[PDB]
Amino acid sequence: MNPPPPETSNPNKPKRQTNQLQYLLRVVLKTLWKHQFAWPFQQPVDAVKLNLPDYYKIIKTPMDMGTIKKRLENNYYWNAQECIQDFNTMFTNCYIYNKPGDDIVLMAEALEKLFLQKINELPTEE
Ligand SMILES: Cc1sc2c(c1C)C(c1ccc(Cl)cc1)=N[C@@H](CC(=O)NCc1ccc(/C=C/C(=O)NO)cc1)c1nnc(C)n1-2
């Protein structure tokens, strides 16, 4: 069975808007989301439909861009680092579960290259 998805709303979690978080939505997420290779990462891994019964035995901190998108739209984060960590968790999970040269790894690598290029221009905090 699939686990519940990561939370995207929690009144107990401190949060704010920052210009860096705005950039993470308007530049970083938008750039990756529209990419031809985005689709496997646009929602949680459905280990039932994909017949990956071991997925959530290996991947204990799942993350995906659907979750990130909702978190950004909900202003769920306190700082840019929290959101950058979610992106890196997503990429790392893919590399942990899969193997070098797999199609899904090539897709993650293409998205990660753009992620790195955009994060390199993260604005200074206002
Ligand atoms: C909806 C999702 S989420 C997700 C995947 C898919 C289809 C994929 C995946 C996505 C795109 C591509 Cl091109 C190949 C595999 N992988 C699995 C992991 C997975 O099933 N591995 C086995 C697998 C199954 C089918 C193919 C098909 C190739 C093909 O060319 N189809 O004809 C290859 C390996 C995986 N990991 N991390 C993520 C994220 N994924």
Swiss-Prot record:
The record marks N98 as: Acetylated histone binding. Disulfide bonds: none annotated. Ubiquitously expressed. Changing D103G: Found in a patient with a neurodevelopmental syndrome; uncertain significance. There is a cross-link at K57 (Glycyl lysine isopeptide (Lys-Gly) (interchain with G-Cter in SUMO2)). Phosphorylation by CK2 disrupt the intramolecular binding between the bromo domain 2 and the NPS region and promotes binding between the NPS and the BID regions, leading to activate the protein and promote binding to acetylated histones. In absence of phosphorylation, BRD4 does not localize to p53/TP53 target gene promoters, phosphorylation promoting recruitment to p53/TP53 target promoters. Interacts with p53/TP53; the interaction is direct. Interacts (via CTD region) with CDK9 and CCNT1, acting as an associated component of P-TEFb complex. Interacts with RELA (when acetylated at 'Lys-310'). Interacts (via NET domain) with NSD3, CHD4, BICRA and ATAD5. The interaction with BICRA bridges BRD4 to the GBAF complex. Interacts (via NET domain) with JMJD6 (via JmjC and N-terminal domains); the interaction is stronger in presence of ssRNA and recruits JMJD6 on distal enhancers. Interacts with NSD3. Interacts with NIPBL. (Microbial infection) Interacts with bovine papillomavirus type 1 regulatory protein E2. This interactions may serve for the tethering of viral genomes to host mitotic chromosomes allowing successful partitioning of the viral genome during cell division. It is linked to Cornelia de Lange syndrome 6: A form of Cornelia de Lange syndrome, a clinically heterogeneous developmental disorder associated with malformations affecting multiple systems. It is characterized by facial dysmorphisms, abnormal hands and feet, growth delay, cognitive retardation, hirsutism, gastroesophageal dysfunction and cardiac, ophthalmologic and genitourinary anomalies. CDLS6 inheritance is autosomal dominant. A chromosomal aberration involving BRD4 is found in a rare, aggressive, and lethal carcinoma arising in midline organs of young people. Translocation t(15;19)(q14;p13) with NUTM1 which produces a BRD4-NUTM1 fusion protein. Chromatin reader protein that recognizes and binds acetylated histones and plays a key role in transmission of epigenetic memory across cell divisions and transcription regulation. Remains associated with acetylated chromatin throughout the entire cell cycle and provides epigenetic memory for postmitotic G1 gene transcription by preserving acetylated chromatin status and maintaining high-order chromatin structure. During interphase, plays a key role in regulating the transcription of signal-inducible genes by associating with the P-TEFb complex and recruiting it to promoters. JQ1, a thieno-triazolo-1,4-diazepine derivative, and I-BET, a benzodiazepine derivative, have been tested on tumors with success. Treatment with GSK1210151A (I-BET151, a I-BET derivative) has strong effets on mixed lineage leukemia and promotes myeloid differentiation and leukemia stem-cell depletion. This is Bromodomain-containing protein 4. It comes from Homo sapiens. The chain holds residues 44 to 168 of 1362 of the full protein.
